[PDB]
Structures are given as structure tokens and as C-alpha cells.
Symmetry: C2
Subunit: 202 residues, 2 copies
């Protein structure tokens, strides 16, 4: 395991993650390059702050479900390559209706460079601690639509509120949100900005 990085599962004890990119259940239809393990990897500092966010279980009984943490540069390249492929309509309906695969790298859904490769960015949700179900956010992970924006409309009051709560828990835990994606958070004072890693998640 790379230095300054750890498997977050051993730090965030009772977490029920699902490494989306380590399974065929993502927008590309199959595990992205560099993902040979269904585990979330991350920087010790990310784990530390995630622990603080998860301890905000004090909020409205929420649990966190992690989807993606550190993402290898090659995974980002894999995304870019995928965006450049002809439309097979395999994941369109679920991940990007309303947008075309042509404009993926212009509307800015799949950039050439990801904060994830720095190891301090995380994708997550919150599940009800009391009921166990997933807190409704109005759009799915990797929705790639204006619907996924924090400030989005067309989302119910509960869904918008829910996003606000996720954000609040993250911001109060050392993270910075991102307006275009309610699920995206980056550690505010990350250990390796400028550093885009490429070791595999395994």
C-alpha cells in the first residue's frame, strides 16, 4: 500500500461501501482500469476526516456509503477513452439521459484530471441509521445532469434538504463540497494537491 494512503474500511469500521468502479455497476458498464478490488482506498487524512463525518451520526441518524475515493490516473484515462467511444446505449438511460457521450468532456463530466487522483476526494451518501434505507438525494451517483447539482431544482424539498445535510456533515468534517455533484467532497487541506497517483486499487 502506497505511503500516506490506507484502506479506509479498516478506519471507518461499520461502513457499508460499494466500490462502484470495482464492479460492472458504473457508467462505463465495467470495472475501470486500476480497480481490482471492491474496497475504498484513501489518504490517512481522508480517513481521519471521514471518521469525523461518520461520527456525525449524531445528525439525523445517517450512515455513510462510500463509492469512490482515490482514483488512479489510468482510471481517469479509462473514463476519457470510454467517453470517446461510440454510443451503445448500455448505460445512457441510467447515467446520462439528456446529455450525449460526445459532450461528456466539455460539459465537464469526465475531465482529463480528477481531484480523486490526489487521494483526498470522496464520493458518498448517507443511509438512515434508524431505518437502514438510503437517504433519497433525487439523482443517482454519477448522474451527470443538472439534477446532480447541489443547487438543483426539480428535486423535492426533502431531497434538496438531504443533500444539504450530506454537505453540512462533510463541510463540518474538513471537506469542501462541489456544486455540480452533491456526492463529491474533497478534503480541504489535503496532503497531496499537485500529486496525481497511478497505483491500482487492489
Amino acid at each position: 500500500m502506497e505511503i500516506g494512503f490506507t484502506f479506509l474500511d479498516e478506519i471507518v469500521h461499520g461502513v457499508r461501501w460499494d466500490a462502484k468502479y470495482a464492479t460492472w455497476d458504473n457508467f462505463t458498464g465495467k470495472p475501470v482500469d486500476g480497480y481490482e478490488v471492491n474496497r475504498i482506498v484513501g489518504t490517512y487524512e481522508l480517513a481521519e476526516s471521514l471518521l469525523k463525518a461518520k461520527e456525525l451520526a449524531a445528525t439525523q441518524g445517517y450512515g455513510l456509503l462510500l463509492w469512490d475515493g482515490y482514483r488512479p490516473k489510468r482510471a481517469v484515462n479509462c473514463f476519457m477513452q470510454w467517453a470517446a467511444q461510440p454510443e451503445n446505449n448500455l448505460t445512457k438511460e441510467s447515467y446520462y439521459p439528456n446529455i450525449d457521450r460526445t459532450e461528456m468532456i466539455s460539459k465537464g463530466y469526465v475531465a482529463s484530471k480528477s481531484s480523486h487522483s490526489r487521494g483526498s476526494a470522496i464520493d458518498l451518501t448517507l443511509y438512515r441509521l434508524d431505518t437502514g434505507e438510503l437517504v433519497p438525494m433525487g439523482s443517482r451517483f454519477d448522474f451527470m445532469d443538472e439534477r446532480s447539482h447541489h443547487a438543483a431544482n426539480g428535486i423535492s424539498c426533502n431531497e434538496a434538504q438531504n443533500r444539504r445535510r450530506l454537505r453540512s456533515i462533510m463541510e463540518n468534517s474538513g471537506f469542501e463540497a462541489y456544486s455540480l455533484e452533491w456526492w463529491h467532497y474533497v478534503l480541504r487541506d489535503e496532503p497531496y494537491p499537485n500529486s496525481y497517483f497511478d497505483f491500482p486499487v487492489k
Copy 2:
């Protein structure tokens, strides 16, 4: 970690599992009791034989995707409790159309006792090594229908053949198949028959 058991991912190196029960993506709609960490746990002997089955990568370029290995008794109880709950139609369409939740524990889909609790049973599939996609099996994991039977009809020649290949790889690796579920395999000479464990998957 319990004795004679290990995290399979540490033995089965480049495996791309997806602990279905450790995520809301199962028939109950949420992580079953005992499923905390998104990892496949199993007996050393199960790992040993899974390694042999995975080395049958020699077959038609197949990779294995693990869904479930050791399953705590409490997870089995959780399934039973779920089967006894009123129908909310939340997962019906995907996991059990054609069957009713009333007859779940009679048609034998959710028994009071699972070979999984012995730690040598495994649920898996094979993905094409060459292309990367999932090998089509005709029915989804936990389909709970006659369609899920190894000898089932209503499944294409390729799909039936595919199941046969999974089975063959497993049988040649020390496993015994189960006719009612193409994904179910049990180690033939398992270390703890008669032993139904209840430590959590974490």
C-alpha cells in the same frame, strides 16, 4: 477474524467482487444483518479451491466475480424475517416475479439453514477476461425462479452453456454445484459441515 476463515480478497488477488449483501443491492433492499464490510469472507479451504477455480482462467477467458461466501446465521434469520414481511413490491420485479413472498420459505428460496453459514459455500459468476463484460447466464443473482436452475429451459444455448462452464470450473476445483441455483457452489470436503457460524462479516 474467526479461525479457519480469511478475507478471500487477500488470497484471490485480482478478484473484482461485490458483496451484494453488504450493499442495498440485494433482494431485501438493504445490507443484511451481519454484512458490514463490503468484502467476501470465507474458509481458507474455500479460498484455496476458489483460487483453483479462478486459475481456470485457462477456460474461455473467464474471471470470477464473488457475491457471497460465508453468511452469518443472523443474516439467514434476517432473510427469513424479510420473507415474513408484507410485500412492498420494492425488489419483487427484479428478484422474484412469478413467485410470492408468502411461499419463499416453502418453494425453498429462503431456508432456515444455509450451507453458507458453514463458510465453504460461494456465490459467483465469470466475466470475460478478453472483453471485460459479464458472461450472460440468463438470470440474475438471487433470481429465485425456475429460470435460475442449472437445467433450466427458457435460457438460450449460450446462457445454458455459460452456466455449464461455471459449473465445470467449480466442480473441477473441488466444488459441488446445486441444481436450483447456477451461482451456488459448496466446497465438497468442507472443514466445518454441522457448524453454522454467526460472527459478522466485518
